[PDB]
Design a protein around this ligand. Structure first.
Ligand SMILES: O=c1ccn(-c2cccc(OC(F)(F)F)c2)nc1-c1nc(Cl)[nH]c1-c1ccccc1
Ligand SMILES: [Mg+2]
Ligand SMILES: [Zn+2]
Length: 313
């Protein structure tokens, strides 16, 4: 109860900032997450014994893949923590509880492959879930873990609060399916421009929470250049492995995933910053002004990629 977590001074300060890197020391990541929960939600919202046991089972169910791993999970939860802490009064208690856990769990048991590769492989998960394949699996994995004995961190919520939070989590996780992001942002842009946007309309919150999830999920593009540059290696390591697996199936992969076309990465990064990242953080800044540092950091990194193409690095 009276056991707060404390971080070293640099971390205590730097953790509040959007561009914080969680560092290479795996064994501090759990404490960093509990620190975030306690500050964001209260020392009360979860029973510590049950939380710490939830965290470790979650960790155990992330795989040793280059990018969609445990570190990603915690990094994504941290970005949401920065958003929640910079928009204090906009969010309900259950929402703050749900979203941090949602982020930690959002890529559970990811194997390193896109929904497309599963479908083309004819993986069983593709039969069980025709759209948002991995994402429906991530949420399923989340509920399974919540149902382990001693793992229900929501135990002291009322029945309705319980269905409310599991619904927040389900929508949040599904929303990290980037195929759904484009339409979701288009609608939020339309609604913000025409002035219809209304945070008391539950379905409008849902969309806004979806955009936040896209923002946290992509937050590697909002780090300092050296963090962003090095994370890009891990991302492409999965992409090329998948490209290899496509070719194994007799399918020529898209250039993004072809390790022969490694030369074209810098250009592919621009496409991505322009088509996805920049619009995402733009619309998020309009809806939630204090998240601007994410837009600024992303723009700075777009420009660092432009310097790469131009042979200046
Ligand atoms: O660096 C990247 C270059 C390309 N793509 C990408 C991923 C799907 C599709 C697509 O094409 C289309 F533009 F059509 F969407 C591009 N994504 C990233 C990326 N960066 C961060 Cl941080 N997270 C991702 C990411 C990881 C897994 C999955 C998705 C994104
Ligand atoms: Mg995912
Ligand atoms: Zn993710």
């Amino acid at each position: 109860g009276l056991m707060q977590f404390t971080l070293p001074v640099r971390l205590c300060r730097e953790i509040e900032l959007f561009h914080f890197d969680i560092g290479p020391f795996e064994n501090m990541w759990p404490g960093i997450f509990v620190y975030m929960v306690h500050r964001s939600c209260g020392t009360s919202c979860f029973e510590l014994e049950k939380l710490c046991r939830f965290i470790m089972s979650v960790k155990k169910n992330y795989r040793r893949v280059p990018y969609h791993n445990w570190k990603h999970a915690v990094t994504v939860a941290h970005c949401m923590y920065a958003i929640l802490q910079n928009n204090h009064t906009l969010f309900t208690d259950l929402e703050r509880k749900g979203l941090l856990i949602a982020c930690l769990c959002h890529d559970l048991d990811h194997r390193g492959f896109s929904n497309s590769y599963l479908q083309k492989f004819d993986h069983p998960l593709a039969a069980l879930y025709s759209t948002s394949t991995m994402e429906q699996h991530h949420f399923s994995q989340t509920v399974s873990i919540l149902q382990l004995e001693g793992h229900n961190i929501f135990s002291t919520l009322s029945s309705s609060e319980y269905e409310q939070v599991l619904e927040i989590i389900r929508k949040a996780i599904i929303a990290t399916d980037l195929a759904l992001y484009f339409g979701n942002r288009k609608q939020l842009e339309e609604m913000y421009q025409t002035g219809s946007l209304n945070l008391n309309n539950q379905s409008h919150r849902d969309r806004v929470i979806g955009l936040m999830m896209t923002a946290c999920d992509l937050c590697s593009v909002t780090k300092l250049w050296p963090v962003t540059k090095l994370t890009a290696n891990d991302i492409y390591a999965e992409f090329w492995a998948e490209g290899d697996e496509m070719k194994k199936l007799g399918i020529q992969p898209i250039p993004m995933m072809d390790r022969d076309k490694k030369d074209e990465v810098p250009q592919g990064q621009l496409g991505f910053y322009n088509a996805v990242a920049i619009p995402c953080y733009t619309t998020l800044t309009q809806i939630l002004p204090p998240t601007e540092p994410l837009l600024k950091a992303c723009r700075d990194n777009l420009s660092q990629w432009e310097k790469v193409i131009r042979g200046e690095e």
